Amino acid sequence: MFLYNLTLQRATGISFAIHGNFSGTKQQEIVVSRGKILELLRPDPNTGKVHTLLTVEVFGVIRSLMAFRLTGGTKDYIVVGSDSGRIVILEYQPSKNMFEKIHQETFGKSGCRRIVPGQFLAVDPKGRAVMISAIEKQKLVYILNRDAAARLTISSPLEAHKANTLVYHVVGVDVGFENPMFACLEMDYEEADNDPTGEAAANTQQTLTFYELDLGLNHVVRKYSEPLEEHGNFLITVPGGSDGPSGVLICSENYITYKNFGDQPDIRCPIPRRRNDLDDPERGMIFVCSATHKTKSMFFFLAQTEQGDIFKITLETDEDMVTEIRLKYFDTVPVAAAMCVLKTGFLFVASEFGNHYLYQIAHLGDDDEEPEFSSAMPLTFFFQPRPLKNLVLVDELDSLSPILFCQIADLANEDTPQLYVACGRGPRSSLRVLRHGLEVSEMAVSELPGNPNAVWTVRRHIEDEFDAYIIVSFVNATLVLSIGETVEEVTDSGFLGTTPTLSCSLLGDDALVQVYPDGIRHIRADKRVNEWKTPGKKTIVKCAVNQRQVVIALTGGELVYFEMDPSGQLNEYTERKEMSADVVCMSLANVPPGEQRSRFLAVGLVDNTVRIISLDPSDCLQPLSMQALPAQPESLCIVEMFLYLNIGLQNGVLLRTVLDPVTGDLSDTRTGSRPVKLFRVRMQGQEAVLAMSSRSWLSYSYQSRFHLTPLSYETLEFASGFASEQCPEGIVAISTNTLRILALEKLGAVFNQVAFPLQYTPRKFVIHPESNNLIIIETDHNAYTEATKAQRKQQMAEEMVEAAGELAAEMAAAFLNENLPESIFGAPKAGNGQWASVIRVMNPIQGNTLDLVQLEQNEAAFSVAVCRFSNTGEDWYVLVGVAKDLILNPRSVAGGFVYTYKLVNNGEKLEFLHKTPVEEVPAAIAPFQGRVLIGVGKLLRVYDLGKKKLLRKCENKHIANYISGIQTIGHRVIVSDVQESFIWVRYKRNENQLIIFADDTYPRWVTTASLLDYDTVAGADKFGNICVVRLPPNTNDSQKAEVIMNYHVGETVLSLQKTTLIPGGSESLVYTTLSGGIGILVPFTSHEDHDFFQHVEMHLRSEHPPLCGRDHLSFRSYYFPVKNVIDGDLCEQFNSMEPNKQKNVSEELDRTPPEVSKKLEDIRTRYA
């Protein structure tokens, strides 16, 4: 009855992006702003790859993010605007890797109220004053000053309130060397509320009010009041003074206007139109963002329209004034919210719906073939589309599109459940498949006869970056190979590898060591045979290779150590330690280049009592301590990030131990009932471990933290590294009777995905239980079809023929021959009642389509279901709802239809059978007990299969709202109302009447519902309120439903589903959010488990305030109070606290910090 909040995916959508220097280095970096997540990332001109620096959740809705600079300073500051009643200043420390709060000034109320600022934020580019204001009645001025100690100080805000005034946009205008100058658009509505006739609504213009501040007299006075003609949206920050005029560029509806205070006349420049455009001419075209590029030579700006066209504003400035404005067609990019231009030739375009790309500027576009457009030419211009020609694909990221529906089930032959996400936007939609693991990439596949068991990688020199010899061993034979980009069998190696070699290490600078139980032969580069015979007939079981030491172990528990003599020979220790067990594993860490050598040595034994063996000659071959073991080990290794001890057994376990002669931490995780072999791998420069199980397991280090990410591959037996010209960072993994080469390009921590092109955004999809197929319905706002576009083009072609220009019209063939892609150039579709309804069946195994059935232009599909009827046998039916005459602003509908499909060949061919009329568009269909139920608007009916029409059996009219979801079970029917929370209806078999007996007091905007068992019914909300309702056992199967758990995520959740994530654990409520994150809910078992985390939640609220200054309890309990839910997001920040504070917290709980973090990772260990 208790829940734990845990998230795996985060918001990968960029809402606000800025550019500046925050790390103090000479390389630019970008600071992105999510809804409530602060992520830091930096580019890389060398390799073109971008990695995330730090991801910290601020636990607050960020409404704005921007930066400034100080006069004579060297480090920029971060100002975050949120929905709280305070402003914060951040200063990231590259060494500490954390955000430090500088100031915190609370001025007013918090929340999304009327008198809360935060949305609009502007600063003087010189760096003297900053403006934050609300939509209405509030304008605040903050003055920033610093003392002689180079410490920034903040003063109280100035009262510049103005009641009954609407603020459109606030921008910081830079005017030479003068007080921080501000331009804004203001509106008055006093006359609108006093004129019921409606005359005040017409011809209402706005002004461009300019504010001047005095630093001496401490007052704010309005200087200019210049009314406008058309409405404005935002202003472009144009630097003035030395470079360019001190003016602003106001973007307008279908027009652009430059206005500067003084004697500057207004400049009017119309926006051109694409040739023979199919869009509605009555529609407008506006700008969405404006980028500022500061270059010492010349200055130019970039903008973005709704059609993804980039226009650069180039100004030919006078001594003080400006002459004209020039426009040209440069590039084509998808629809984006805001973009930032970077230095040293880099352009980052941050999309708003889809993936985030990283373009590189290659050409400046000087003296192209298309003429430019200016304002001096009179008169309605047109431009022709052109390809990119300037930007190329450099870097891509795994950006998750907003999700409307999700489903988790088992559809492959493997037992691992797959995740299906239905997301996208129009032509860029994709039904991507999520896989837990890393991206497995193959380069070369070869076949080798025999049973390969070991492959080695020996470099020519320690500090080189290329390999020199590769050896593949067998049970009885061995072959020598070499790398020359023409890899074949080499002859002049001089190895004589006739006998099975146990190991091939690098002892000398360019020497190799081979291990065979009949003697040890050192292979030197010089022609010297350093063969050491084995005294007696005894053999060897394992080996211990090292850069400066040689360790062997004979049968019967005998240890011999060899020492590497710098003269060139090798020595033997004059003592052999006797042991009571048999050697089963052996391992040793590498010699540090800076230090002398290593000391800790671990030997595995059947006695399961591992002992630390010293390596110094003073205490050579002497016991140090003892550590207990669960069972017989199989593999052991020592990883250095800071060294650690790792133990592997013969079953699916993975034991971790800190570097300590005395026994310490004991952390285990399921890894299988197979012998786990642990090897040495290299990634990101730091050491890592690679265990073997039924599925390959990888555990690397990231941001001084060790994770556990498995590999999506079958059972493996041996692996090693790979480094050559073709693949500097690769992993070689031998398979059964074949040779394969692997590589790791993408990091792929969790939730890898593969894209598949689509045509429209899918609403829902239903899994075919028998033939493993899918049924997908597609509908988009203002969408066309193939038939409508074809006839429009033919009608358009006829019109230009009818025009008969000077016959001399030969462009008809060119218009129909050259077609532009829809996914990259956008979709030129317009109208009011234009829609599309695409029903497609796609096999999840493949990526191609099976059948394409189109419908009328004025038809849309909102629901789909599969039903069965008792009259037929094992036939499967497909029913798709049809929407007709949907009107947005007013409430006026006409009805719809329901289509029944034969579903020929269990999901391979569809055909039309008949139709049936309904009075309202269906929203949810759920069959039960051999019949079908369709909710037709406010009327709830039960249908049956007939000859020509669906037979009606019952009719309900007590529902006074729109039905948004119908969930049926063998006993009752759960109705999800758009206004009410839940309606419980039972349908009888003999009476045949829908009976309503229970309801809910709390009104909820339910979007979807899920069933956990017979009594529990879950529901979502439009804003992110998830609740579970328990009905009392005494119900009339007076019944107001009670609530036991209510929790607000803070982000829009549109799907709820509970299933088993991994085989070997319990189920959990796995739900995704509209932002693109995936969260899980961990149930509790015992009372002390909830109590300990309850104390942690209570303690961490006061011992660790959030970064943006937001109250933790009320933010989560914003719409509804948090009941029976423990937030785990705050507990995850326990590792980001100073050790002295962490020590105090541990002593308050009477525990140790290592043990506290163990239980925090244990929750993710069990159910994830």
Partner: protein, 132 residues
């Protein structure tokens, strides 16, 4: 252990609407005891939260006249939430019902009007945005 009051409140509303108007001379005493236990600052927050739905969700005739004149019984705990004190029960949980208190009132009017909306705007602005 908050199911105890939910069952009591459900039964309290059940007896209010079923037959509490026949010979009920206590029909006024049950109302009288409501503000005797609620309209006093000497009582703890547990019983203060127990009478948040025992007055509002019982009708609208003799309900609105009671909720309006009080100023020192609801504004006290609203601004006493940012204190960093011991375990609490209704410092943030009682705000759910006051938001619900502007739902049924708006529904009745859709089928003190301007003053009530203005007064509720300074207390909770999400009530008018989540549901209209």
């Amino acid at each position: 252990h908050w199911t105890l009051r939910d069952g009591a409140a459900l039964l309290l509303s059940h007896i209010f609407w079923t037959h509490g108007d026949l010979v009920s001379g206590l029909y006024q005493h049950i109302l009288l005891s409501l503000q005797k236990i609620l309209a006093d600052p000497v009582r703890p927050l547990c019983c203060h939260y127990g009478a948040v739905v025992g007055l509002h969700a019982l009708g609208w005739k003799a309900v609105e006249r009671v909720l309006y004149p009080h100023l020192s019984t609801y504004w006290t705990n609203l601004q006493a939430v940012l204190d960093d004190y011991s375990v609490s029960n209704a410092q943030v949980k009682a705000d759910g019902h006051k938001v619900y208190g502007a739902i049924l009132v708006a529904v009745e009017r859709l089928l003190l009007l301007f003053q009530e909306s203005s007064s509720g705007g300074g207390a909770e602005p999400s009530f008018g945005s989540g549901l209209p």
